[PDB]
Design a protein around this nucleic acid. Sequence first.
RNA 1: UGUAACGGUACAAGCUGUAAACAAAGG
RNA 2: UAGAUUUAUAUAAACGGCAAAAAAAAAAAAAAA
RNA 3: UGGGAGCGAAGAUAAUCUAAUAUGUAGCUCCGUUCAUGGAAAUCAAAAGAGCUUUCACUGAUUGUAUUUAUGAAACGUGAAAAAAAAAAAA
RNA 4: UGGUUCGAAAAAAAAAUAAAAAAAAAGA
RNA 5: AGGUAUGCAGUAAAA
RNA 6: AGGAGAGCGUCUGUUGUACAUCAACACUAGAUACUGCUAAUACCACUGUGGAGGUAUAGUAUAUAAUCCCUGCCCGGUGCAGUAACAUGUAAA
Lengths: 281, 35, 28, 492, 84, 54, 81, 349, 57, 95, 98, 74
Amino acid sequence: PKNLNLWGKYLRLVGRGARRGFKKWQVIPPIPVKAYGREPSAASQTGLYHDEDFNYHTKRTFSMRRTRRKIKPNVFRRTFTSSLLNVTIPNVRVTTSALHAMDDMGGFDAYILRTPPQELRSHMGERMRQVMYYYQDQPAIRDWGLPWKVFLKVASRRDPFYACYRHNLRKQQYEADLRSRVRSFSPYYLPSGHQPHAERQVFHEGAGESPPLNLWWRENRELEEAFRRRLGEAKCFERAFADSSEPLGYTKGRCRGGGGKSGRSVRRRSKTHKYRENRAF
Amino acid sequence: IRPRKKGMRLDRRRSKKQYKHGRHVGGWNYRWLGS
Amino acid sequence: SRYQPFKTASERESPFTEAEPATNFASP
Amino acid sequence: YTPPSKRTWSKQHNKIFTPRPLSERFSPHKLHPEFEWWRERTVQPSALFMGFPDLLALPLRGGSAYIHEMDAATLAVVLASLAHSPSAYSVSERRPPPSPSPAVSLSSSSFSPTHLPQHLDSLLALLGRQAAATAAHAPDSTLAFLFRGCAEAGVVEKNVVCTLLGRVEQRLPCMQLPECLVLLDALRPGLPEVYRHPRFVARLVAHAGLLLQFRGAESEAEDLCDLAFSLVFAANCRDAALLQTTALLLVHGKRMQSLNETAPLALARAMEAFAACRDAVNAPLSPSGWLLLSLLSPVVQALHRAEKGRRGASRESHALTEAAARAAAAVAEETQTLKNRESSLFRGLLRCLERVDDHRESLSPGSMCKVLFAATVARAAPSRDFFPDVLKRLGDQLGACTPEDLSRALFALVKLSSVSGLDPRCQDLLPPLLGTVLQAVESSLPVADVASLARLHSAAVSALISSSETKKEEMKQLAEETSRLMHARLEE
Amino acid sequence: AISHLNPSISKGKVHYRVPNPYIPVLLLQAVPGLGKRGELKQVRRGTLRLFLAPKGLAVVASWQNIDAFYLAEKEEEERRRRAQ
Amino acid sequence: TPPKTPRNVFFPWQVFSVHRTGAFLERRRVALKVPVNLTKFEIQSYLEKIYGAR
Amino acid sequence: ACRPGATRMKWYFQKPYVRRVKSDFFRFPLLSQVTKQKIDWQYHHPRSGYEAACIFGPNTLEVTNLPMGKTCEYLQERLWR
Amino acid sequence: SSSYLPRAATHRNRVAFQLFATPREPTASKAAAAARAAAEAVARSSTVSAPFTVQKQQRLLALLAASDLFRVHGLPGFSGFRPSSPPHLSKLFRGRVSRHLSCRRVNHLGRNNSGRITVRFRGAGHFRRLRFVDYKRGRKDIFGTVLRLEYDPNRSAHLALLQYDDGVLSYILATEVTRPGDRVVASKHASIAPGNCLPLGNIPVSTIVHNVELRPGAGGQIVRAGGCYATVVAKDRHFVTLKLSSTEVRRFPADCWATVGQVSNAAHAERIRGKAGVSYWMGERPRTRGKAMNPVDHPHGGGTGKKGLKRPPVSKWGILCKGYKTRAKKKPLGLIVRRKKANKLIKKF
Amino acid sequence: ITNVALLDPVVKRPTRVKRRFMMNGECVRISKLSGSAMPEPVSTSALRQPNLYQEYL
Amino acid sequence: VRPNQGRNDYNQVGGKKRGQGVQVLPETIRLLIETRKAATAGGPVGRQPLPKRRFPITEALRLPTVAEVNAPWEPRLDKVVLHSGDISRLRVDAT
Amino acid sequence: GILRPRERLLLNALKKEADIRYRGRRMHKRFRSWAQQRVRHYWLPQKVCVTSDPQLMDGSYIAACVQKAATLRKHDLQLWHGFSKRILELADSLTPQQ
Amino acid sequence: WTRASGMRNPVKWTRDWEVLNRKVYFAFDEREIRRSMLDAVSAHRKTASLFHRMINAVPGVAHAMSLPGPHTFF
RNA sequence: UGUAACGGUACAAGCUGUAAACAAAGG
RNA sequence: UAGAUUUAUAUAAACGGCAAAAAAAAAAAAAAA
RNA sequence: UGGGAGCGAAGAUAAUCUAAUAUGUAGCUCCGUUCAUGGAAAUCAAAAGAGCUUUCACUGAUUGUAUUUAUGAAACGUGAAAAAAAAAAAA
RNA sequence: UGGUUCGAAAAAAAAAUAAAAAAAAAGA
RNA sequence: AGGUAUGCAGUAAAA
RNA sequence: AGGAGAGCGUCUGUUGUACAUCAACACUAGAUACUGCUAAUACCACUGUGGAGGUAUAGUAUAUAAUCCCUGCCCGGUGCAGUAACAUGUAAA
């Protein structure tokens, strides 16, 4: 038959009834998405997954019990440096196929610029290509080095100066809010300069007399404010967390035994079960 | 429907499902004004 | 998999680390 | 399951996609309730700048501007956009042709597209009123930017300027040197005199002096260069003490490391200011000459770096050419008193002249006059095409010159008229240029300054001594008129 | 490139084998232990991705790069002869 | 529901009618049926300008 | 069935443009000799045809008459070859 | 929990600094000179260098033990209720925690973001405030005075209100021998006295420490509960070995900081509640036994009349809970030198 | 017809056209966006083109 | 207690609600102004041999009159001009 | 949550006393209107700075500055004597409105 | 659900006069104050400037006046 | 587009929009 | 097509990343529709 | 939308039960129906030939798959319907 | 006297409602 | 121990 | 619902609204087991949340229970621990 580069060779010329009656559970191994003719997923369109994406496979046993299971793609979170975009791009979700394609093309920029839409299979990649061409048209905006997603939308492209202004304004608002919260939760408290003496218990006998307080921060109001802000910058502790950017990072599965709550058959989340709990996707 | 589920649900008119049926006073095959 | 490291130590005898560099031109 | 085909195997996501209506299947002969034909749409503005409708698109397309809703930062940005050579090509198009737009080009044009600059007078008045309104809520830097932007865009309404002056005088003590420089930028020659309120200028100069006296450590070299430039020109100051303090902070303030990294154009402007105010520097080689050398060396180093290295680069190349021209002009006046191949002055001057020779086109009319003056003072020539190719463009751009530029050009032409060895094209070009320059100088005599008058008198005397065979009567008349004008201005 | 035959399915994830982890590259500079300039060497994709290309020591052996190298060498030879 | 009152009217449409109450009202008081959307200032200005009532 | 990928491409025959009323610029605007498209003075800017020179340098060629039914990337590769 | 400061402020794997500086001098060079002078002054004042052991702790405790007008006149209080001791004699402050150094506690009640119960047997309890205790001791080479000792409802140990010499107030964990009027400092030049904080590399062997950092500058995480302490066993250039309260021997980087002494309130374990109501106040809920339920509700349930477990003990989720190890086998031991064994084996050997 | 819209003579965007009548009875079509009168429709003489599909049929 | 506790937007940092009085850094304004200023640099192409003054001047004898402005298209109102602009910049015999 | 009985009693008594304090506080507010009127149709639409140099002021500017200062209670002797000096200088050029 | 407050407080307080008398006792005699004596002195520093200055400038006085022992300061 | 709420109209499953059933006779 | 024609129907989509509030700084941030 | 795409059940038949059937059905999400689907052979076939794609009838409930229940508009082919290939190097 | 309004604190939206009608030249 | 009578921003202390 | 006693649960509590108010459940406490912190365990979108902004005098799991005296023998079996696997250990497993 024709289209030997795509799946379905022995279905192409068997008849209409067989094509309509084909049973998916007949296929045990996953078929590549491009050859199958499957719609790209939202995760793939937000990342650079090339030939990889969510798939399905069937489990068949000697008893002839069949079962189909969804299987997720093998994706990593990696950082790239782009000369065409004049910025580092943190935490792009990429795959092995995408990485090999970048190697073939000659790097990240070449892969984004030259790959045809069918092979690239990434709307995010298409948008990056658009931003690269826009930067080529308008180099002065490229000199700013803003994150590439600032110009993802066409309206931001039409109004670059407002895009940069709004980006900086929102960044400053975020910084001020975070600074205020950290100051509120700081472990160091400086009382007023007119009443620095806090309530104390009776000093244990034999304790040496405490020296008079040195209020060096009362010479100038500017010095006082700077010292107060510096004290507000302090933190009680710093926490460790799972981070793939760290060489020794790791994540967690389930308990060693492998059991479950007695009498409970937990149903896994789906698009028709717990579909929109706490977040969209 | 209670506040937590309301905060995550979306309004009916935020999609196109309203225009994909032909329900009307005369039946289920509405012919819109102006055909 | 209670412990799920991001990087798994590579195996010595896996075919991936032992595959042949192949040939530039098949004819010669 | 339908196996894919050549035309069908590639698909897009139902919601994250590139819209391509040409290929998307559609049935235009049917009613589509999803599009809500009955519902009327809102006509949004077709061009926006800084989040508001672009004022450069209103003369052609109309629509409201919402100027009264603009805050101080947006207003300052808009004032800068209107003041700094606005082009209607910066406006956004609607469904444009696939080919690139003229906005990509960085080159200036000799014609204003899509409307005259004066077609925005009403919007300029509205912007001035809104600036007067918002002046009370702006931070110090934004307020200084508003002041300078109004001055540059040409807001002239006297009540508006009075309110702006009041606010600026109120908040002057809270401003650092960079904001003082921004404010001084509003006093440049050619801007409206309403902003040059003498008391405000005196207060600004005093505050800058205090800033230098108590914060000289924090001052950057480029900031000091700009301050000297503004003091000599923007504020028309005789503050020999302040200028000398700036020069000392530039030279002996452990500033040699910063002098190398500061932009060459700022150094060129600073040395121009020092050359203008030499007498102040040489007060209780000359110290002015040492200052000129110290400022010149980094410019020559930048020239050497560029030559060794040999759209973005065009701007820096133009800036470097302007810096070279200004530095050469500044050095020429000092060399007038030296008359020797000084170990470094003459050599840096020659290198700047070579840069000018390789970048003659980039020169503005002031640059052309400056470079002609420098070459004639030095009695040198970077090449044999220099003088003819520069005289041609000087004649083509005579109309845009100022009295200072005309005095420099007349000095150069008087010097050149006495040279026996000249090219045929130079001989042909000279007399017409001399006549036109003399006419322009005579016309613009009442607006010339003291330095321009002195240069013109020197040129007239030199011509009388050596060029008595070309327009001799006009040169005697010019000499007498310059003497009388200088006497009057000295009495003033 | 990956191969879609006999993948490893575990933890709900799919991992695909890489039968051929090698790619040809053109050497733009002398790399001690790899080759001289202008050679076409089979290297490992990781080696190209993380060392050679970032350090500017080699580039993928595309027809564009091969032709560019060839033409540049020819131009340099002609420049030598012009200088002589 | 009723059209909002413009800043300048020139042609008021509002009907002020006398209402006969079954309750008691003082000597200097009178009850009127009026559109729901009118304010006390609007009512007072309407009566003082169209009738001259104090 | 689903939204079309780059494998599905369509184009339509272009009707030659005739200014049926020569004086009616609102309904029959002049074509531009540069862009070979109707002039839209309201929403377009004049193009000299040399704009791409400022982007790609003096050693640049403009190629015209490229066909339909092909990806821009495929055509770029073919033209490079 | 995560209901306090956001992730962006709380999470940082690698801390780039260990000295929270608050210089007073106008320039960086003068700030460095002042820091050197302060370090030298701390070194000069430091005299004690011998290890601080269990026996020395006992001696100090013995020394501390060896070493009608004050009321509200005319105030007849409650009929029966009275404080156990007046404010001028109580060991703890008897007042209120500083408002500027604490906030209201967000009571999750054992439920996660899904709203389901994940931590069983939790109750409302008494209202509590979270107080911001300096686990880092970031301020170095500045002496502070312990003004008072305070109760903490979320923590088994006592807190101490430290007033630095410049007036800054903070809360730190109190040591078993910490008393009002004590002088404390954090520095590498500090003497080996209880309450002082030093890098593990500057603390002699056999010394007793608490509030140990796993990562330098990230704040102490190990040995916090009342009465707990760890012992310094061995020291090398890069690592210091500690024996922990669980009988675990583990290595720590020599740059990780720690505080000398035992954690205060060693008598916590001696408390007797006497009734279900005390635990109810503390925030507990009744624990129903697995074998008291139906077979659908627990593996041990079912059976007419009372019965035994009928199998080796397992939890609600079918996991052996008596002797079955749960640490991940593949997870590397890292700096752990030796981890404890079962208590029966420990006490029988 | 719903897939198509009239164009304002000044703004050249989709508009709505209303018929107004003067005292003499002259009718004027006015566009909402700019208030401009609509230009007179192009004449049949200018618009005419042969319908070759009907000849083919 | 808090129905929206777990949402991605719960207790989010920043926002226009809490950032009412926050301005962009002055460096951002400087950057925008300089980018606008440097967008039209270049050499002086085109010739201006004569001076025909930093602000443009309009000549009154070239403006169309009311009659011309109102005249229909072709393939006392003649001596009156209605001009929108700056009278201080108009070039007229008398004002 | 729960409170210790002493704390319960003390806070309950505080709440009761707060309620009674509010009731006592509002007793004499017979002529306190939540709806209040403010006159602003005399305020000019132009903006002025009151401390601007008088020598740059005209009648229209100085009149507005004087009225604004009176409204804002900026009773500064130096400012108002400068106002007097400038107004006497400008006596010839004031309209009835100014 | 209701938003009534102030004089329309929906809280069902007790009307028992004896209980309200006990409430008075708890609210006035047994009220708890956070601030300290030096806090009050600082609050009134403008009227008691000399004694505020002495308390802050004489060593030991602040320590003596900040001790837990119930004190009366004139 | 469709529907509805109020209002007017015989206080209505009709009609209708504060111009709430009617302008057709204007420089 | 003589005029007039209130209010609701959460609409910058006559439009384009997805994603709360028809479109929300980068990142955290997760997708078969 | 018993048309097309994705995910995807059980009640029922197998006289329990498994496969298979039900069925790629129901629900859910997305296209929006001749101006559509699809498509001008690296096709099918035999050593003769057909000639993109599409619809109907026959071949035939045949050859098949399921191997207790059933499913199966199979392929080639035959008779019809409709018929198309490609305006187009610029002007 | 309350609601409204600021805070708690909320698109956690009470269809036909508002300090809520294209948003300052406002003509004092 | 919510907010009280020229009103918008805005820091500290507290019966 | 008094005086004198026995049984079961120590006790105050919870409890099937509308056939079970009990000897059933919980309980103060004594034990055992796991867990070195991105802890274990739980939720099962999993670089997320509760645990806990806690750190072995802590948290989780399973018995037995408050006070006094006691709590015998068995590791052959099963499970678990231990070791490369054995040996061997562990019954308040």
